[PDB]
């Protein structure tokens, strides 16, 4: 149950119905091994593709860092006409078609725009997090370090993850880290939206993805 979805049925199931038979015809199949770069930004051949199996990372690449924009799973649509790089996170099979062909089927077969909405919403979600993370780069680093440090020092193992009884509210965390209550508030909300953590009570957080948070502390 990927949270950006507007429908409960996977697009691959829909495409393999007989009401959608003939749309499949216009797609070709390509395989990619783990870590293979599928596409560099704005490729010469404008393609719309569908992930058939595996996981694909859509990302902005710079010299010293990369920002993940989205992770495409089975049934997710994307294209080659963005400023993003596209990499296979695991052994991957895609189905692809020329853009001129997809123009027709997106207006005719409703299930496609529904998935695009889900994928573009996810990309925008991660983009806003990235922008917040750049505006508050230093505060974010300090907060993530504070939390990972607390997790290792006093974190408690629970079935959902690591419970952090910080004994500090957001105001007090901001004081500890030399930022504002408002900034820590934005950043914690962002960590929640990333599925990194949940709020247990005023002074307690549940760290559900420590390993991921360890990437923001570097």
**Rounded distance between C-alpha atoms, residue 86 and residue 80, angstroms:** 9
- 34, 90 Cβ separation under 8 angstroms: yes
106 makes contact with ligand HEM (CB under 6 A)? yes
Torsion, CA 111, CA 8, CA 32, CA 20, rounded to 10: -30
CB of 113 to ligand HEM, least distance (A): 9
DSSP-derived pairing of the beta strands 66-72 and 156-158: unpaired
| 83 or 157: CB nearest a second copy | 83
| 38 or 79: CB nearest a second copy | 79
| 149 or 202: CB nearest a second copy | 202
**Rounded distance between C-alpha atoms, residue 78 and residue 56, angstroms:** 10
**Rounded distance between C-alpha atoms, residue 216 and residue 218, angstroms:** 5
Q: Which residues bind a second copy (CB under 8 A)?
A: 6-7, 60, 62-63, 67, 82-84, 103, 106-107, 110, 113-114, 116-117, 120-121, 123-124, 127-128, 130-132, 134-135, 180, 182, 189-190, 193
Q: Which residues bind ligand HEM (CB under 6 A)?
A: 3-4, 6, 48, 77-79, 81-83, 99, 102-103, 106, 116, 119-121, 124-125, 128, 193
């Amino acid at each position: 149950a990927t949270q950006m979805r507007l429908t409960d049925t996977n697009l691959l199931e829909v495409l393999n119905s007989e009401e959608y038979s003939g749309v499949l015809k216009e797609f070709r199949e390509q395989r990619y091994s783990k870590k293979a770069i599928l596409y560099t930004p704005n490729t010469e051949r404008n393609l719309v593709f569908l992930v058939k199996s595996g996981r694909v990372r859509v990302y902005l690449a710079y010299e010293d860092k990369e920002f993940t924009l989205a992770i495409l799973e089975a049934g997710d649509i994307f294209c080659t006409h963005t400023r993003a790089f596209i990499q296979a996170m695991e052994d991957t099979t895609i189905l692809y078609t020329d853009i001129r062909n997809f123009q027709n089927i997106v207006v005719e077969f409703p299930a496609f725009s529904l998935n695009m909405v889900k994928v573009l919403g996810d990309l925008l979600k991660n983009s806003l997090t990235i922008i917040n993370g750049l505006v508050f780069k230093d505060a974010r680093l300090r907060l993530a370090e504070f939390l990972v440090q607390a997790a290792m020092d006093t974190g408690l193992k629970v079935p959902q993850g690591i419970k952090l009884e910080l004994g500090l509210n957001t105001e007090e965390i901001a004081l500890m880290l030399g930022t504002t209550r408002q900034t820590v508030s934005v950043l914690l909300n962002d960590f929640k939206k990333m599925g990194i953590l949940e709020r247990v009570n005023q002074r307690t957080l549940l760290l559900k993805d420590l390993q991921k948070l360890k990437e923001f502390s570097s």
